[PDB]
PDB file of C-alpha atoms in Angstrom:
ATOM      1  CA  UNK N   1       1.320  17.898  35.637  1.00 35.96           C
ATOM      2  CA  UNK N   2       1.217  14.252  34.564  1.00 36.10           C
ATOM      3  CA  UNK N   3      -1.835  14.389  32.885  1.00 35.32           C
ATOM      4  CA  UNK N   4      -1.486  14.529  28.724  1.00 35.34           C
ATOM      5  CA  UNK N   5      -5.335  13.623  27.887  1.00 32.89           C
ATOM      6  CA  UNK N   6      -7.076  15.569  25.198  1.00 34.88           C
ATOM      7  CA  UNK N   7      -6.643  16.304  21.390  1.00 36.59           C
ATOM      8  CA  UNK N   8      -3.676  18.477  20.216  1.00 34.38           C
ATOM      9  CA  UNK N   9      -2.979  20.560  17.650  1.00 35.32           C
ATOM     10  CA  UNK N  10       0.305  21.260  16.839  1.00 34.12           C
ATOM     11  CA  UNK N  11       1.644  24.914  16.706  1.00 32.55           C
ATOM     12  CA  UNK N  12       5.587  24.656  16.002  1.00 33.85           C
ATOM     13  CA  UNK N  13       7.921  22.335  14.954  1.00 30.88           C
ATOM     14  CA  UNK N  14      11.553  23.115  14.906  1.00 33.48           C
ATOM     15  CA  UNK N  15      13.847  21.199  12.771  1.00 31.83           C
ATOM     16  CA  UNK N  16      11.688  18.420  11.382  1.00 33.14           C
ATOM     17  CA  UNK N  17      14.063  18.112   8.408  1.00 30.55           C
ATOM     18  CA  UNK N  18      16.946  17.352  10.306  1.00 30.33           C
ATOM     19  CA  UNK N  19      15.006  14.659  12.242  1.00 31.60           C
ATOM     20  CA  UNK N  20      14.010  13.205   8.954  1.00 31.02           C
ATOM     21  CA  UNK N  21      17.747  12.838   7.398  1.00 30.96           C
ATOM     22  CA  UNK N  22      18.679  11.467  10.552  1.00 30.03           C
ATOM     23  CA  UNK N  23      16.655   8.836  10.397  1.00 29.31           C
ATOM     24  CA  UNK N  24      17.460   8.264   6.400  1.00 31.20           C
ATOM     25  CA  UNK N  25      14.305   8.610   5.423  1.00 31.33           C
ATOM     26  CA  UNK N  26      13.903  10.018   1.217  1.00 28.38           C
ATOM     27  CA  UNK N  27      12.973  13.154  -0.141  1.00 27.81           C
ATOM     28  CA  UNK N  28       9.548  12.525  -1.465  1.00 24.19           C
ATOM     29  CA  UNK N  29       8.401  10.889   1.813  1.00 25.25           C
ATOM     30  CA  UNK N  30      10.218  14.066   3.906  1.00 27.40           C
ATOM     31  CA  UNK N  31       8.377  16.872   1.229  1.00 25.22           C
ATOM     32  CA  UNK N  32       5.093  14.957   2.557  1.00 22.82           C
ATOM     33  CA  UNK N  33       5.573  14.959   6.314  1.00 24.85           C
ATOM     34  CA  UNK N  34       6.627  18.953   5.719  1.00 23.02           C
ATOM     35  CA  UNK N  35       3.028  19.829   4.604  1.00 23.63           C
ATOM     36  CA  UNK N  36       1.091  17.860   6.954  1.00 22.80           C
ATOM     37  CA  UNK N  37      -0.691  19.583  10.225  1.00 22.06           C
ATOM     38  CA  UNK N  38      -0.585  16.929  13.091  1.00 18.75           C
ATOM     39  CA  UNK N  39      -3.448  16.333  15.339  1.00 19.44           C
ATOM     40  CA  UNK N  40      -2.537  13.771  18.680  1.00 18.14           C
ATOM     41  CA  UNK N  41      -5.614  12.768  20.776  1.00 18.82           C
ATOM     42  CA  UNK N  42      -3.886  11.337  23.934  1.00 18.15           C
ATOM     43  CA  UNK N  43      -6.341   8.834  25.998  1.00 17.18           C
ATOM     44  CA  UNK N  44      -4.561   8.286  29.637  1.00 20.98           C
ATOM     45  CA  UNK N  45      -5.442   6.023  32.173  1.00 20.57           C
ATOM     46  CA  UNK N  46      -2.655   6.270  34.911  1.00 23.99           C
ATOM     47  CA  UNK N  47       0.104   5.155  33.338  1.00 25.52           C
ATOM     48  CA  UNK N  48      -2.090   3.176  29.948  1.00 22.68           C
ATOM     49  CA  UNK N  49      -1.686   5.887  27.204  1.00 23.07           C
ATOM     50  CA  UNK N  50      -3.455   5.626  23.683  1.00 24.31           C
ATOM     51  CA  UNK N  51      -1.522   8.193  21.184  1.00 27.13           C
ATOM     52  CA  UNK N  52      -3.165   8.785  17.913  1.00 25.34           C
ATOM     53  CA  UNK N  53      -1.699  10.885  15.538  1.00 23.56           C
ATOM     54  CA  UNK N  54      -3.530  12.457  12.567  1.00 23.55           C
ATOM     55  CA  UNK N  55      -1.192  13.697   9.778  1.00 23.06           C
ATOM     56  CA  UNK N  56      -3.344  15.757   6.969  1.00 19.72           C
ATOM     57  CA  UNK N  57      -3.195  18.277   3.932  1.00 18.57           C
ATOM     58  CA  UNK N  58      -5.406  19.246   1.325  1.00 16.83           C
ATOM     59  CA  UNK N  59      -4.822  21.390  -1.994  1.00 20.65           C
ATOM     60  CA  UNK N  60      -6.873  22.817  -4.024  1.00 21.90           C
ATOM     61  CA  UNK N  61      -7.499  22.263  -8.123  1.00 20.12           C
ATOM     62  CA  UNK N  62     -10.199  24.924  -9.209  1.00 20.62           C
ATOM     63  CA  UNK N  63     -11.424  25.407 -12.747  1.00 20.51           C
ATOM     64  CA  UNK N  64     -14.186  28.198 -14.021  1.00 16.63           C
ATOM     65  CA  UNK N  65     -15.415  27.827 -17.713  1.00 12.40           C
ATOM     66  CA  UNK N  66     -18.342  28.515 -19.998  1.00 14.03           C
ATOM     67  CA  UNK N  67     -19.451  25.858 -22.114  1.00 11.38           C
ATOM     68  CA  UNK N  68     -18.257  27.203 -25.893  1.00 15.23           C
ATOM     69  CA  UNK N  69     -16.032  29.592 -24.136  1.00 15.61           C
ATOM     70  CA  UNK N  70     -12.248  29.111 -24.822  1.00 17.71           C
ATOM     71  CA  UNK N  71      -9.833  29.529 -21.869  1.00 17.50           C
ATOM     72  CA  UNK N  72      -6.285  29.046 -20.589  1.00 16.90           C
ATOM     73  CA  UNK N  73      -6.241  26.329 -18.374  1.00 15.68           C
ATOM     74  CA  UNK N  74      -2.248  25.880 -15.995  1.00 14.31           C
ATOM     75  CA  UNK N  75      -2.503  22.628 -14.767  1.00 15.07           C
ATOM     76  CA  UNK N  76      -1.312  23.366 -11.486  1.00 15.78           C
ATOM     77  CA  UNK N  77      -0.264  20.393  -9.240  1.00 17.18           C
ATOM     78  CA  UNK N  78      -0.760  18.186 -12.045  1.00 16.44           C
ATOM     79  CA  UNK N  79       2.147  18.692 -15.250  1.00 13.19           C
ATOM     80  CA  UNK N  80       2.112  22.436 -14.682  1.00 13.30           C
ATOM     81  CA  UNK N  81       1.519  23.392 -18.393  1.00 13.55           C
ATOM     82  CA  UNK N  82      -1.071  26.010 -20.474  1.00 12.81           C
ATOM     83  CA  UNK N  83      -3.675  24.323 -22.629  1.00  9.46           C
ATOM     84  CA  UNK N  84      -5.952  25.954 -24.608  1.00  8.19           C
ATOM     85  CA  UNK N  85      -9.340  24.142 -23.100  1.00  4.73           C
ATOM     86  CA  UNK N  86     -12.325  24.273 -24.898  1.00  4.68           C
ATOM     87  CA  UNK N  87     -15.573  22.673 -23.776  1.00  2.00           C
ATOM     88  CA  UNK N  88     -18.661  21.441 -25.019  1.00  2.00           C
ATOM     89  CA  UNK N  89     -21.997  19.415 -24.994  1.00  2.00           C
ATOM     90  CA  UNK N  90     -21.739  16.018 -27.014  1.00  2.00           C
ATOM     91  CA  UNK N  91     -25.680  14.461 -25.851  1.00  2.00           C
ATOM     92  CA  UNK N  92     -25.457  15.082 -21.990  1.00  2.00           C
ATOM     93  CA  UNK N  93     -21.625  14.482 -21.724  1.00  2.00           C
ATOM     94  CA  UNK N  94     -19.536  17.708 -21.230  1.00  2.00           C
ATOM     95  CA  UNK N  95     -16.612  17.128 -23.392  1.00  2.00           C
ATOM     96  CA  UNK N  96     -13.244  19.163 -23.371  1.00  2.00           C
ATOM     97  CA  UNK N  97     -10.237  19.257 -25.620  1.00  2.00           C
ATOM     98  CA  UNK N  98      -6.884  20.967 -23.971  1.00  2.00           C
ATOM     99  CA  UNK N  99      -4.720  21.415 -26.925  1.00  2.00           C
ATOM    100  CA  UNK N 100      -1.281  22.285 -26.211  1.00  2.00           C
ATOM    101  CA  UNK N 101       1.866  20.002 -26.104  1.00  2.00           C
ATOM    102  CA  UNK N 102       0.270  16.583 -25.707  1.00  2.00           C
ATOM    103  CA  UNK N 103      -1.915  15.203 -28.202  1.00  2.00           C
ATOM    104  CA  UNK N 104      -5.154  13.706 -27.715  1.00  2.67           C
ATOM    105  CA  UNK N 105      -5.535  15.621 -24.368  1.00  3.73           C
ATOM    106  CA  UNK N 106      -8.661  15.892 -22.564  1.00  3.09           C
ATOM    107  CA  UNK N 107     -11.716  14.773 -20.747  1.00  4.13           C
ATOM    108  CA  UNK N 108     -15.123  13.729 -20.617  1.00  4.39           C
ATOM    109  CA  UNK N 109     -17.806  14.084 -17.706  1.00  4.44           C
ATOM    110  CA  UNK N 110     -21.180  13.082 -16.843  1.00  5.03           C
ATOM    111  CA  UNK N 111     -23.437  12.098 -14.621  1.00  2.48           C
ATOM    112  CA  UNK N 112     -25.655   8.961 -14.205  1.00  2.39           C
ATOM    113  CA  UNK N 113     -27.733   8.394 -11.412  1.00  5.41           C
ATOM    114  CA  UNK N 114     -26.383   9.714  -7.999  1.00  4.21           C
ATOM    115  CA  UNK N 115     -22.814   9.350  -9.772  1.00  2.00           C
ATOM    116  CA  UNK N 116     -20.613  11.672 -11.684  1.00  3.49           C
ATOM    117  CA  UNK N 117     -18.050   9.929 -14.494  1.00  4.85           C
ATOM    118  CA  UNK N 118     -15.074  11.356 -15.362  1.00  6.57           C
ATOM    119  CA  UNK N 119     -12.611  10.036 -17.633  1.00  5.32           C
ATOM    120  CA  UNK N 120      -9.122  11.870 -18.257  1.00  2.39           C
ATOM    121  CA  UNK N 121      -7.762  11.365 -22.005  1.00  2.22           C
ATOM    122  CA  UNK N 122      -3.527  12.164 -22.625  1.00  2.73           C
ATOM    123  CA  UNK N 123      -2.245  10.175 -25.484  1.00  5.78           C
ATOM    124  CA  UNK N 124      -3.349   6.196 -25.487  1.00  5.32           C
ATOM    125  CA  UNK N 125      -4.037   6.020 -21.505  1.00  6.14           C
ATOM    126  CA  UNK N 126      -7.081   6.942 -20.091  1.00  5.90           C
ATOM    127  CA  UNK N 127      -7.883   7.293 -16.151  1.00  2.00           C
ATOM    128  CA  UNK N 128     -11.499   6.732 -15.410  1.00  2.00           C
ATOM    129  CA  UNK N 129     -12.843   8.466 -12.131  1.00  2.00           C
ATOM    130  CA  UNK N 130     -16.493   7.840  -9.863  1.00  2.00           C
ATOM    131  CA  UNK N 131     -17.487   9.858  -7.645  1.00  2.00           C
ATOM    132  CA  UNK N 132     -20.689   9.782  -5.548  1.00  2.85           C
ATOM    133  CA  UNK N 133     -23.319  12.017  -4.181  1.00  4.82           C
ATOM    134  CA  UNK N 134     -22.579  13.581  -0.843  1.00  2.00           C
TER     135      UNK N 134
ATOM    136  CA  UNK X   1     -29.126  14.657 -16.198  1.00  4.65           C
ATOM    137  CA  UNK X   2     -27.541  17.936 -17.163  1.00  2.21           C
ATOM    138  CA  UNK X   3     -27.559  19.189 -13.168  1.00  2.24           C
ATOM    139  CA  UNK X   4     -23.507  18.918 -12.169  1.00  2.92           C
ATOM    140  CA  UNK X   5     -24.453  20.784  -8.821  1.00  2.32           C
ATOM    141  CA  UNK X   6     -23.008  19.379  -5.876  1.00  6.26           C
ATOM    142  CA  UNK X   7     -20.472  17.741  -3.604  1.00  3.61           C
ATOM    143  CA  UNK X   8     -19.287  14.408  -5.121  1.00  3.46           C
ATOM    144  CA  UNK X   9     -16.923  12.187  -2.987  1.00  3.72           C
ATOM    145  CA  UNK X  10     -14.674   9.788  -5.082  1.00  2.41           C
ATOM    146  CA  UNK X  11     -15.092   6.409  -4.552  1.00  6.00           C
ATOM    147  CA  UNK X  12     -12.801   4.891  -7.378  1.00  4.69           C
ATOM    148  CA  UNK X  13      -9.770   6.063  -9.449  1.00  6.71           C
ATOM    149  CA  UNK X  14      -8.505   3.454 -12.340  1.00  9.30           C
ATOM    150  CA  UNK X  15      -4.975   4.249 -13.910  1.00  9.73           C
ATOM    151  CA  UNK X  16      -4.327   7.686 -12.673  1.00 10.76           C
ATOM    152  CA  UNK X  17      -0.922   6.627 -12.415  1.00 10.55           C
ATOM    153  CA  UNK X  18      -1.028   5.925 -16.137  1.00 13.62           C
ATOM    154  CA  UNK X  19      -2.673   9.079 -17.311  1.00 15.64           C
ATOM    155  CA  UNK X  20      -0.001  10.836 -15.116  1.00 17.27           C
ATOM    156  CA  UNK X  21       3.044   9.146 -17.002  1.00 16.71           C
ATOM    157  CA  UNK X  22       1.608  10.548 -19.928  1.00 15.41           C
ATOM    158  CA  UNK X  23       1.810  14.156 -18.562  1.00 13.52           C
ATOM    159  CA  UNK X  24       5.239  13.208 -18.055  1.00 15.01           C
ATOM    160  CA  UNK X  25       5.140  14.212 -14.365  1.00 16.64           C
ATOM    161  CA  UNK X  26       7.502  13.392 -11.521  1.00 14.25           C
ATOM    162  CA  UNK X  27       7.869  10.527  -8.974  1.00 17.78           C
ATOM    163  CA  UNK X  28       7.046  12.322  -5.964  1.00 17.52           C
ATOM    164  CA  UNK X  29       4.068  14.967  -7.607  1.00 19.10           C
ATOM    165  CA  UNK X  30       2.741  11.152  -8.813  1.00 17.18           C
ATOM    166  CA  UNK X  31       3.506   9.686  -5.056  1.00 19.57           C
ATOM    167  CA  UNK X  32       1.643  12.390  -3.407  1.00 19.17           C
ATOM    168  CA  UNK X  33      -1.345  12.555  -6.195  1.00 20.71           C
ATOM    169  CA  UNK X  34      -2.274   9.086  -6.186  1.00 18.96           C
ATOM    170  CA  UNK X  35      -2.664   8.701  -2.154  1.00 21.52           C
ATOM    171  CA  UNK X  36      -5.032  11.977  -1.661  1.00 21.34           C
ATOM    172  CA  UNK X  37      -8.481  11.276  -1.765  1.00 19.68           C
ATOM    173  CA  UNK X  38     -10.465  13.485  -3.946  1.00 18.38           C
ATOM    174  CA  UNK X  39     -13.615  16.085  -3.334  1.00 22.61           C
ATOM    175  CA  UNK X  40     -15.648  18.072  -6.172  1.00 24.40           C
ATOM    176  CA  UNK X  41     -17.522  20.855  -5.668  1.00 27.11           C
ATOM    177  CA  UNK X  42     -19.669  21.994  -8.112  1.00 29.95           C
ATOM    178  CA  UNK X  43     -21.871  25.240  -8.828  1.00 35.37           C
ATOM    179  CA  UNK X  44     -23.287  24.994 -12.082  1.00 36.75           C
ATOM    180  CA  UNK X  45     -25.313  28.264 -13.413  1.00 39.08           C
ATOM    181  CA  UNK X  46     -26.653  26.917 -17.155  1.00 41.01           C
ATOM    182  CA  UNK X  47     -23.180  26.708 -19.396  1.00 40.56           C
ATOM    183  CA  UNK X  48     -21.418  28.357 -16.229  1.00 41.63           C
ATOM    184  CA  UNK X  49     -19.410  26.452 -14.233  1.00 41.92           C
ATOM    185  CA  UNK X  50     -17.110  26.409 -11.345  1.00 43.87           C
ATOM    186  CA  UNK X  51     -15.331  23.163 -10.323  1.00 43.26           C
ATOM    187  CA  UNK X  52     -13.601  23.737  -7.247  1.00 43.50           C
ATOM    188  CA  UNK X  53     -11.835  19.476  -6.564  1.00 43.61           C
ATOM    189  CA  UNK X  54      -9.989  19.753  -2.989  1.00 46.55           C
ATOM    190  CA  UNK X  55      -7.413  16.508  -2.677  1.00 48.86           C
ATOM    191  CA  UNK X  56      -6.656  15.424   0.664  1.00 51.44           C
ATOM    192  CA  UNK X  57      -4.176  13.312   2.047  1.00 54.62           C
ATOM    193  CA  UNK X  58      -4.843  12.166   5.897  1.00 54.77           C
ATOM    194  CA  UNK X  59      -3.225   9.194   7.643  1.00 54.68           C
ATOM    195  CA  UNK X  60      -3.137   7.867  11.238  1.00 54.02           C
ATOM    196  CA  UNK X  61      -0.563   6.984  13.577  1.00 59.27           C
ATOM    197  CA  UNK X  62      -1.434   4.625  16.873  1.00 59.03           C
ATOM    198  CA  UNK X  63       0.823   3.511  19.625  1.00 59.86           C
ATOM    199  CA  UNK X  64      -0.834   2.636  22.678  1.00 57.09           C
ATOM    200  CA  UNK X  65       1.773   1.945  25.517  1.00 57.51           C
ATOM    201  CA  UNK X  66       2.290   1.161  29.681  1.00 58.14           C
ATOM    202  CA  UNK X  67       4.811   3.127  31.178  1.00 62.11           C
ATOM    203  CA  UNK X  68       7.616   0.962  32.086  1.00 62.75           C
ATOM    204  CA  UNK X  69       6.484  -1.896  29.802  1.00 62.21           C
ATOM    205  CA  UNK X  70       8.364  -2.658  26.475  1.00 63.54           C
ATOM    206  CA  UNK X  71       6.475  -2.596  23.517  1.00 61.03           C
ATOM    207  CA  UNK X  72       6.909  -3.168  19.620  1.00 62.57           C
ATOM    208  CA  UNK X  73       6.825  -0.500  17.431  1.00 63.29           C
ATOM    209  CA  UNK X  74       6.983   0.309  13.884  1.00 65.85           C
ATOM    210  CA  UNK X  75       7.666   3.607  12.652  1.00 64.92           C
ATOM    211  CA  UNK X  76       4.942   3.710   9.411  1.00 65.84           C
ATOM    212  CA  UNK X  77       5.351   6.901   9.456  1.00 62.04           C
ATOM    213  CA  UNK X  78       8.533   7.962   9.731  1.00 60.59           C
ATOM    214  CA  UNK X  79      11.262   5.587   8.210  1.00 60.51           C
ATOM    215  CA  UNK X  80       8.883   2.474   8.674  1.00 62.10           C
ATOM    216  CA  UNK X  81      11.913   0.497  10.902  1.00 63.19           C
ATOM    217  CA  UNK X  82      11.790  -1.882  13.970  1.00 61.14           C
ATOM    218  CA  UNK X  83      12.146  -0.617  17.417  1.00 63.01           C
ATOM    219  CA  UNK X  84      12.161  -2.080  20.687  1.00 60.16           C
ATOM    220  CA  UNK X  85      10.397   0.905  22.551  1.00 58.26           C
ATOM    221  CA  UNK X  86      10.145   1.464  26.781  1.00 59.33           C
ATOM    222  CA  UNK X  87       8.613   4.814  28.455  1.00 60.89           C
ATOM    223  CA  UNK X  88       9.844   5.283  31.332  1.00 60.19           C
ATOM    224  CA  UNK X  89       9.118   8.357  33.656  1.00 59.56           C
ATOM    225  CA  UNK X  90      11.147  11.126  34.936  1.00 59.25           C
ATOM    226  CA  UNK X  91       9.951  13.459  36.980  1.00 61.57           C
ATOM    227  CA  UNK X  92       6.491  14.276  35.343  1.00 59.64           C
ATOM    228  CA  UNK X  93       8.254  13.530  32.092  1.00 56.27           C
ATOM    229  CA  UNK X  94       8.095  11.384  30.080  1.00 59.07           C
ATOM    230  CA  UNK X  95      11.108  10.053  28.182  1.00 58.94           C
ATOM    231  CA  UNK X  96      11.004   7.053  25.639  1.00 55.84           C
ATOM    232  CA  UNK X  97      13.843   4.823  24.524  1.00 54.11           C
ATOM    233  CA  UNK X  98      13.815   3.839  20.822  1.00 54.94           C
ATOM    234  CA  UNK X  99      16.030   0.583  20.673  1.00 54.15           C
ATOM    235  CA  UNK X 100      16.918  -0.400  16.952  1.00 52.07           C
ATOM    236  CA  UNK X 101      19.427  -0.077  14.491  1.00 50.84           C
ATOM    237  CA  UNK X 102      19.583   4.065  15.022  1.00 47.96           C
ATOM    238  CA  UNK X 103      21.815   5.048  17.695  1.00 44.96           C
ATOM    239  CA  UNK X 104      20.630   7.303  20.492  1.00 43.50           C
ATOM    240  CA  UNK X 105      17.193   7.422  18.901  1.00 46.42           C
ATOM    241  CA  UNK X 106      13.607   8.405  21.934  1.00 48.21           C
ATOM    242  CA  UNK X 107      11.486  11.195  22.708  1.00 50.12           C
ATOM    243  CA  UNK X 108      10.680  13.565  25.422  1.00 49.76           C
ATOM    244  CA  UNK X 109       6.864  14.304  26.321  1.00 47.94           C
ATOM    245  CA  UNK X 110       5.720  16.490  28.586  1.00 48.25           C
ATOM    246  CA  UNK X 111       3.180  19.009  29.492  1.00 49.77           C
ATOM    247  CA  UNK X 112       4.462  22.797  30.552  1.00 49.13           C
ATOM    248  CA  UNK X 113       1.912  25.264  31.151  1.00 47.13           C
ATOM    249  CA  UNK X 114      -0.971  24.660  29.246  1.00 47.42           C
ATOM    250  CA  UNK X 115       0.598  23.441  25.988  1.00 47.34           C
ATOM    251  CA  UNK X 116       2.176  19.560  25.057  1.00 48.34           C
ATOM    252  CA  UNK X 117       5.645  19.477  23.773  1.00 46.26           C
ATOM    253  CA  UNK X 118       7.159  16.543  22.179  1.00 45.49           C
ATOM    254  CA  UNK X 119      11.469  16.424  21.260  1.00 45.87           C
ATOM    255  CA  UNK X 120      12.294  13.614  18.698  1.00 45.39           C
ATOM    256  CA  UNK X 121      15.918  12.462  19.463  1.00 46.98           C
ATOM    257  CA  UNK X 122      17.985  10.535  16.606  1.00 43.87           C
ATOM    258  CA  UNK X 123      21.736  10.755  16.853  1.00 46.83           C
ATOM    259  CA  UNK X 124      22.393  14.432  16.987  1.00 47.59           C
ATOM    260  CA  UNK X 125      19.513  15.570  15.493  1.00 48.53           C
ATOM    261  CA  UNK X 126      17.078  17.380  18.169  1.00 51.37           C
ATOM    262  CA  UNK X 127      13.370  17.763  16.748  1.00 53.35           C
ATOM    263  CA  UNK X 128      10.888  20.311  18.630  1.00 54.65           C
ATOM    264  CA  UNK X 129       7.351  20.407  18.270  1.00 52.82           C
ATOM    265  CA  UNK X 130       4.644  22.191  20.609  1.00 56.80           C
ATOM    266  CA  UNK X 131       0.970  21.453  20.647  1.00 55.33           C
ATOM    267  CA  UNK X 132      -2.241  23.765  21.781  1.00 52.58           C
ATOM    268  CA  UNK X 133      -5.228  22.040  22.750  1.00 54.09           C
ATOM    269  CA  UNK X 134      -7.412  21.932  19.479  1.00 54.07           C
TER     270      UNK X 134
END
């Protein structure tokens, strides 16, 4: 049949690397395309096609800890080393101090409103995160 | 307020790609990092906590083509390159030509039994992928 319309999960994809080098294209963007599922929805009208290609991932990060309670936190995903994390209540902020290689290596969180604050201490940079309520 | 529970959706991220220098971590861990978006679940049980943060990276592809008529497309992403692209069909397939600065670069589309396959063509590079409907 002629007819492609629907959405599409792929099942199998054979030599996706070698497609890749072919075309040039660098490592990091090649070690991306690798972990992505791909999802085509394919709108056909005769011969007018509409091809829309989703290309996703998602990893997970996942910490358990007891405020006062020392534990060994490997930072998976982010510079893979242990740290010694230890966290606490400073007012209502939950504070924590990794100690390990870096110095000055932590984070802060709160929450204020609907929000949650997060700020990520290594050294003299700081990342500041929002997120909102779902 | 002390009550973390929830589902919190990031809505801004400000120097993660300093922080990350800090940690000393890699081009590509920091390429992929920086373009996931960013979900936290939390279950919070007095000083007990689990923080479970999912980071997901999604991204869509469009063309939207006539069969037999020429069209302009650029390859975001694959190699992000110019190509001068006409679908033509043959038989109930259908075959594309990819005309650009790679040689012998199209694709073959076509539906066989009840699944959707799709060959990627560059040089001598054959790329197979099969789709179920989702």
């Amino acid at each position: 049949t002629r007819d492609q319309n629907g959405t599409w999960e792929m099942e199998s994809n054979e030599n996706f690397e070698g497609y890749m080098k072919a075309l040039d294209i660098d490592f990091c963007t090649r070690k991306i395309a690798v972990r992505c599922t791909q999802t085509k929805v394919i709108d056909q009208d005769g011969d007018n096609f509409k091809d829309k290609t989703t290309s996703t991932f998602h990893r997970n990060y996942d910490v358990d800890f007891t405020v006062g309670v020392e534990f060994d936190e490997y930072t998976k995903s982010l510079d893979n080393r242990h740290v010694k994390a230890l966290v606490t209540w400073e007012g209502d902020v939950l504070v924590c101090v990794q100690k390990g290689e870096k110095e000055n290596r932590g984070w802060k969180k709160w929450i204020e409103g609907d929000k949650l604050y997060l700020e990520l201490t290594c050294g003299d940079q700081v990342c500041r995160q929002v997120f909102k309520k779902k």
